[PDB]
Design a protein around this ligand. Structure first.
Ligand code: MG
Ligand code: MG
Ligand code: MG
Ligand code: MG
Lengths: 98, 167
RNA sequence: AGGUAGCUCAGUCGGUAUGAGCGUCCGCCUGAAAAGCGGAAGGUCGGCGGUUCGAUCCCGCCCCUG
């Protein structure tokens, strides 16, 4: 499960679900699915605690590499959609100041 | 209180909201800004939502000592309203200035009382309705003379802001 | 000695923040309120760094109060 095959398959499933989210609501559902407690990437970390000690460094920097890749995609997408939401508020609230 | 005239023009200038911010001019000199604060500023600063603010440089406001000599005609007035369609981002003050420039001396008062958007207007448009009060200095103004002044006001608004008489 | 949700505070001894009260929001109640029930939103765990595959938790420095 900590293999670089099931991990990279889960990062790719997450990075395209993040790319396909066009709403903060859609992106929230994507977050709980690809980063929440029941996510493959989060269960890969909880397995590091019952792992033999001589296998945690070689597989920990692998699981961490997978987590940081999907986390980076979600964070940049959340900022992008929030800015688009915020910009749309300012234009919708324009008034004739004269 | 300063006995000066000001104009408010659209502006973008933090910490104000860029769609709800006026820059204040006396003549062609900027003297400050006014409007609603930026929602991002309000949140970052812990301010109440919707906080508004004004700041003017008093030293840039020239001191004035006017000596008015008003013309007070006692002859009856004529009251007419005009409804004009313009692009939605045309400042209402610019339309009223155009109406005034064409109406001439017979126009004593102009007041906007309606700003309307809707499907019977069309998209990207708005309708402004002004109450006009006409008066002559030496005679009882006729409705035809008033309507001629009104027609010249509508023509001036057509040429200056693209106003179209409401149909 | 402590800094943990917008405020006031439990708690977590390296890999699941386990939380309360208030406040806010949302229902019920009222013509509408307050109060009262009912439910929800809400957490880089003081900042900058070190160590470590991984730090709210260990180390260094520093800000804040008694
Ligand atoms: Mg009439
Ligand atoms: Mg109208
Ligand atoms: Mg009732
Ligand atoms: Mg809940």
């Amino acid at each position: 499960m900590l293999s670089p095959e099931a991990l990279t398959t889960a990062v790719d499933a997450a990075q395209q679900a993040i790319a396909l989210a066009d709403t903060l609501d859609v992106l929230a559902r994507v977050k709980t699915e690809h980063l929440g407690d029941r996510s493959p990437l989060a269960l890969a970390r909880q397995a590091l605690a019952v792992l033999p000690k001589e296998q945690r460094a070689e597989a920990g920097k692998r699981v961490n590499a997978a987590r940081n890749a999907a986390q980076r995609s979600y964070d940049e997408r959340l900022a992008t959609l929030r800015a688009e939401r915020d910009a749309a508020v300012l234009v919708a609230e324009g008034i004739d100041v004269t | 209180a300063s006995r000066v005239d000001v104009t408010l023009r659209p502006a973008q200038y933090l910490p104000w909201h860029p769609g709800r911010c006026a820059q204040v001019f006396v003549g062609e000199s900027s003297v400050g800004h006014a409007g609603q604060l930026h929602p991002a500023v309000i949140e970052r600063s812990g301010l109440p939502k919707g906080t508004c603010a004004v700041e003017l440089n008093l030293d840039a406001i020239p001191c004035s000592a006017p000596l008015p000599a008003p013309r007070v005609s006692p002859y009856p007035a004529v009251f007419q309203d005009v409804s004009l369609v313009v692009a939605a981002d045309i400042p209402a003050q610019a339309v009223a200035d155009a109406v005034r420039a064409g109406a001439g001396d017979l126009l004593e008062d102009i007041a906007l009382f309606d700003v309307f958007t809707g499907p019977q207007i069309g998209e990207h448009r708005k309708s402004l309705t002004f109450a006009l009060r006409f008066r002559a200095p030496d005679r009882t103004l006729t409705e035809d003379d008033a309507s001629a002044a009104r027609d010249a006001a509508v023509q001036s608004a057509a040429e200056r802001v693209g106003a179209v008489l409401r149909g």
